[PDB]
Design a protein around this ligand. Structure first.
Ligand SMILES: O=C[C@H](O)[C@H](O)[C@H](O)COP(=O)(O)O
Ligand SMILES: O=C[C@H](O)[C@H](O)[C@H](O)COP(=O)(O)O
Ligand SMILES: [Zn+2]
Ligand SMILES: [Zn+2]
Ligand SMILES: [Zn+2]
Ligand SMILES: [Zn+2]
Lengths: 152, 152
């Protein structure tokens, strides 16, 4: 494990063959309300566009998944609710170790009044994408599929 | 966009603030057969473990998503089938531009006889994970949720 770079949100290392990008673990929050899912959008310079996503972020030091989940929901949408741990996944285990912890939010309450809050019915997000009008981050897609799988 | 590294499967660059890992687009194949989903496992040095995944890989030069999908299914499981484009997503648009194209495979036929082929019912993969016995890559999770959403 030889490091070629130690950055702000990632490190670039080598393990002989493998190029490994170490990355901080992250969280994602799935929230449904009156048939609409809470998506969000922000400019993403890494991809040149603003894909459809759900409240998410990096787990800060001394903070655990749940806590991180709570903070992200509040900082990105100004809402708080009852969170339940659903599952987790490695974004791309082929080169990075970024692991995302997904949560479900219920009984959302306005606790606060350029990260666009986008309430939208999962069915329409799915249609817009199939029509090529909008893109998906892993979180957005997982939010939609999860919904179609367990929240209808 | 200043490059700090140009590697084999990724490039590390800077856009003033942003640390950007350019990555080749990838494909993923969802296949169900007699209630079992076709998962796969391989050692992943980037994460130190072998998460539950579905046939996937990098799109080679001159190859399009579908073609890549076909090749991966065949090289990793020795099967071929009827593939349909489902949707796509950016693994982690926060730092990388890796985009994955997900396909569904049907009417799988053995076209060929350390990437472990793991046939397993999505319900059990889901239970094992909830029990903390197994991890998920984004592809594996998407495969499971997609199944629970549209293939039951
Ligand atoms: O998460 C997997 C990504 O596709 C990585 O880029 C990984 O290195 C790809 O490896 P492979 O082609 O063996 O699936
Ligand atoms: O795909 C998003 C990943 O979490 C990236 O690491 C991204 O840089 C995180 O940014 P933020 O905390 O603003 O969501
Ligand atoms: Zn954030
Ligand atoms: Zn931070
Ligand atoms: Zn491959
Ligand atoms: Zn290759």
């Amino acid at each position: 494990r030889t490091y070629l770079y130690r950055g702000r949100i990632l490190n670039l290392a080598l393990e002989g063959r493998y190029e490994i990008v170490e990355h901080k673990p992250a969280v994602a929050v799935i929230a449904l309300r009156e048939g609409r899912m809470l998506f969000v959008r922000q400019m993403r310079p890494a991809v040149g566009l603003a894909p459809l996503e759900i409240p998410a972020g990096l787990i800060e030091p001394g903070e655990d998944p749940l806590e991180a989940a709570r903070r992200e929901l509040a900082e990105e949408t100004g809402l708080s609710g009852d969170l339940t741990y659903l599952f987790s996944y490695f974004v791309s285990p082929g080169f990075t170790d970024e692991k995302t912890h997904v949560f479900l939010a219920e009984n959302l309450k306005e606790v606060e009044a350029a990260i666009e809050v986008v309430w939208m019915r999962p069915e329409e997000a799915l249609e817009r994408h199939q029509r090529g009008e909008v893109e998906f981050s892993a979180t957005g897609l997982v939010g939609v599929l999860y919904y179609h799988a367990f929240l209808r």
